[PDB]
């Protein structure tokens, strides 16, 4: 069940590539269009969704946090409590190789304040990218980070100004991140040699799953599923399994029930239907559920972007007679 939601004061800041993050009930917004204005220097917002209306209130930062730029297609995730962000596309079209860590540091009445801490890395440090995926893993005690690539600009030797913005999927290396120590190490998979982006990542325990996304060197949206495993003294292995989607967003309606809502199916076909992932311990398979009641506007549209709150509901955007640039929906399960 989904419904049309209206935004008010500063709608303009919403854009494809924005990210949402979840803290103990409250929803927060990141990655506005443009650099942060005087009216909210942080670029991070209270996401007030009340009775089919969205108010975007400001948020403050700690006295020792970094003021990170609006990153545009960052790889984001959680930690058992904090958020991880890396990297993305600044509003100057530069690509961030930096990891920012989002903690919460104070809570009051209506509003709260965040900590934002950059952790720099030695490696084997991953190449500045966007649309990629980052997640967390729990081995034989205790935790580590897994990064599978997206796309990025040309090498700083082959890049030409005539094709300045030409992007390309970076190496399908798997990147292991030790946060608390602050270091990274890359791994080549014999089972993996095709780069992907705008895909979908889902992980638990010491295993990570990756679903169909979009390649570039072939222009192919696979349907293949991929496994990743981890040990402890560190090492990694992979396997393949039996959908084709691009820029899909995954919600959690129930515990170990992830509702993957749409994205794109072909280069001009938005999937418009849904799916349900059969999750379990070392046993997972892609199944299909019903198809929601998309309105006329959403039906005859070409562009899809949005992200999840966390409680099964999801936030959706649609272009757009000189009246409004966007129309927004909220999708609950």
Tell me which residues touch other proteins (CB under 8 A): 16-17, 33-38, 41-42, 60-61, 63-69, 72-73, 89-94, 118, 131, 151, 156, 159-167, 198, 214, 216, 246-247, 263-264, 267-268, 302-303, 319, 322
Q: For other proteins, give the closer residue by CB, 137 or 245.
A: 245
Please state, in angstroms and rounded to a whole number, the distance separating the CA atoms of residues 308 and 123.
32
Question: What three-state secondary structure class fits 8?
Answer: coil
Least separation in angstroms between residue 288's CB and other proteins is 22
CB of 284 to other proteins, least distance (A): 24
- Tell the smallest beta-carbon distance from residue 255 to other proteins (Å): 29
Distance of CA 1 to the CA centre of its chain: 23
Q: Taking the CB of residue 182, how many other CB atoms lie within 10 A of it?
A: 13
Nearest approach in angstroms of CB 96 to other proteins is 11
**Smallest gap, in angstroms, from Cβ of residue 22 to other proteins?**
23
Q: Within a 10 A sphere around the Cβ of 44, how many other Cβ atoms?
A: 25
- Label residue 276 exposed, middle or buried (CB < 10 Å: 0-12, 13-18, 19+): middle
Inter-residue contact 101 to 83 (CB < 8 Å): yes
| C-beta closer to other proteins: residue 88 or 144 | 88
Under 8 Å between Cβ of 210 and 226: yes
Cis peptide before 270 (omega within 30 of 0): no
């Amino acid at each position: 069940s989904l419904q049309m939601v209206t935004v008010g004061h500063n709608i303009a800041l919403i854009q494809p590539g924005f990210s949402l993050m979840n803290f103990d009930g409250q929803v927060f917004f990141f990655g506005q269009k443009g650099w942060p204005k005087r009216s909210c220097p942080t670029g991070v917002f209270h996401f007030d969704i009340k009775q089919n209306h969205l108010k975007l209130k400001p948020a403050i930062f700690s006295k020792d946090s970094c003021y990170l730029p609006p990153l545009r297609y960052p790889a984001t995730c959680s930690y058992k409590h904090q958020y991880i962000i890396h990297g993305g596309k600044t509003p100057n079209n530069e690509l961030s190789d930096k990891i920012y860590i989002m903690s919460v540091a104070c809570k009051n009445n209506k509003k709260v304040t965040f900590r934002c801490t950059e952790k720099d890395l030695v490696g084997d440090v991953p190449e500045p990218r966007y649309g990629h995926s980052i997640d967390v893993v729990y081995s034989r005690g205790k935790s580590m980070g897994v990064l599978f690539g997206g796309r990025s600009y040309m090498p700083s030797t082959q890049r030409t100004t005539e094709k300045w913005n030409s992007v390309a999927d970076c190496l399908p290396h798997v990147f292991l991140i030790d946060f608390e120590f602050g270091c990274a190490t890359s791994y080549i998979l014999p089972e993996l040699q095709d780069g992907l982006s705008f895909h979908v990542s889902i992980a638990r325990n010491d295993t990570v799953y990756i679903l169909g996304g979009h390649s570039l060197a072939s222009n192919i949206r696979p349907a293949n599923l991929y496994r990743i495993r981890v040990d402890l003294p560190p090492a990694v292995n992979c396997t393949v399994l039996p959908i084709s989607v691009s820029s899909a967003i995954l919600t959690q309606t129930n515990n170990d029930e992830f509702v993957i809502v749409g994205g794109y199916q072909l280069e001009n076909q938005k999937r418009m239907v849904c799916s349900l992932v059969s999750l379990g311990d070392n046993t997972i398979e892609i199944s299909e559920m019903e198809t929601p009641d998309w309105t006329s506007d959403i039906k005859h549209s070409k562009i899809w972007f949005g992200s999840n709150m966390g409680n099964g509901t999801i936030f959706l955007g649609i272009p757009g007679a000189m009246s409004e640039a966007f129309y927004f929906y909220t999708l609950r399960c």
